Enzyme design. Structure first.
Site, PDB file in Angstrom:
ATOM      1  N   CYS A 270       0.871  -1.162   0.000  1.00 54.15           N
ATOM      2  CA  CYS A 270       0.000   0.000   0.000  1.00 54.15           C
ATOM      3  C   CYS A 270       0.919   1.225   0.000  1.00 54.15           C
ATOM      4  O   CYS A 270       1.783   1.318  -0.846  1.00 54.15           O
ATOM      5  CB  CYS A 270      -1.014  -0.054   1.157  1.00 54.15           C
ATOM      6  SG  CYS A 270      -0.205  -0.193   2.761  1.00 54.15           S
ATOM      7  N   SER A 271       0.765   2.172   0.909  1.00 53.41           N
ATOM      8  CA  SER A 271       1.715   3.294   0.907  1.00 53.41           C
ATOM      9  C   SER A 271       2.927   2.913   1.771  1.00 53.41           C
ATOM     10  O   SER A 271       3.998   2.580   1.244  1.00 53.41           O
ATOM     11  CB  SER A 271       1.041   4.589   1.379  1.00 53.41           C
ATOM     12  OG  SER A 271       1.824   5.693   0.976  1.00 53.41           O
TER      13      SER A 271
HETATM   14  O1  VO4 Z   1      -2.257   1.457   4.967  1.00 49.17           O
HETATM   15  V1  VO4 Z   1      -0.435   2.059   4.693  1.00 49.17           V
HETATM   16  O2  VO4 Z   1       0.842   0.673   4.940  1.00 49.17           O
HETATM   17  O3  VO4 Z   1      -0.489   2.837   2.950  1.00 49.17           O
HETATM   18  O4  VO4 Z   1       0.038   3.461   5.957  1.00 49.17           O
END
Ligand code: VO4
Length: 276
Positions: free
Chosen positions: A214-215
């Site tokens: 993910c981010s």
């Molecule tokens: O839900 V994240 O690993 O993009 O902060």
């Protein structure tokens, strides 16, 4: 301590009651659970990999980090599935300066599927650099990646790539979830169930870890891993242990399942699955 579904569903009502403080309480214990394990991450913090970390506080534990073969660093960890050691590679959204390292690890690690659960840009803020060709081919070190097709569904899209080391060919398939809210989690666990289902099932039997990102590669990435692991445990055994499996994977990468609204959300997903 696996428990049967009957008592999972029988008692979770408790955790949902009181504005959810039950979950909230199990999740704090989860916050506390790695605190005293001095789990090393010196490759992450080494000053000359600094710019390879999307976020300075989100690191790769040394013991489960993925090493590119012989400058071997990449902010990514192996994470266990349900009876599959190293079932996944949890990783952050790659950066412009880590695209080579990122596709090389894919090549090397033999991974056939890619799960992307962020948009490139969310609410005016960048979350992930576009690491794949928007059409036709693009080259990242020794791997030419080429987009062969795209399919768009309501909450996710499927890009089928074909990749090649320029020093042999592999079809890699990206499932990209596209309707994850700006703040929190989805409102309905159903479209995520179907996404987890189909993407989980595209795993061909003699292939490497499924890459999930993910981010930061912790939050929605962690939430994906528990749902999918807990779902196979259920097909196979008719039991669950969301808490005790979370504490195990949180030693494989920091902050898997970053929030309590996400923790809660594992459970909507699972319960909805059990009654579907
Ligand atoms: O839900 V994240 O690993 O993009 O902060």
């Amino acid at each position: 301590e696996a428990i049967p579904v009957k008592q999972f569903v029988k008692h979770i009502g408790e955790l949902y009651s009181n504005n959810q403080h039950g979950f909230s309480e199990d999740f704090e214990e989860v916050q506390r659970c790695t605190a005293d394990m001095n789990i090393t991450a010196e490759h992450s913090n080494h000053p000359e990999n600094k710019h390879k970390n999307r976020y300075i506080n989100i690191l790769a534990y040394d013991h489960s980090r993925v090493k590119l073969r012989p400058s071997d660093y990449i902010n990514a960890n192996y994470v266990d599935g349900y009876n599959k050691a190293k079932a996944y590679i949890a990783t952050q959204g790659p950066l412009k300066s880590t695209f080579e390292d990122f596709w090389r690890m894919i090549w090397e690690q033999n991974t056939g599927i890619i799960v992307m659960i962020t948009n490139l840009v969310e609410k005016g803020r960048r979350k992930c650099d576009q690491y794949w060709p928007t059409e036709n081919s693009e080259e990242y070190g020794n791997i030419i990646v080429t987009l062969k097709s795209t399919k768009i569904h309501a909450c996710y899209t499927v890009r089928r790539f074909s990749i090649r080391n320029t020093k042999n060919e592999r079809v890699v398939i990206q499932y990209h979830y596209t309707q994850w809210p700006d703040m929190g989690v989805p409102e309905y666990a159903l479209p995520v169930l179907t996404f987890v289902r189909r993407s989980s099932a595209a795993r061909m039997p003699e292939t490497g870890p499924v890459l999930v990102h993910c981010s930061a590669g912790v939050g929605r990435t962690g939430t994906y891993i528990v749902i999918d692991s807990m779902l196979q445990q259920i097909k196979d055994k008719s039991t669950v242990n969301v808490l005790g499996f979370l504490k195990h994977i949180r030693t494989q990468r920091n902050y898997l399942v970053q929030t309590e609204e996400q923790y809660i959300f594992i459970h909507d997903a699972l319960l909805e699955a059990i009654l579907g």
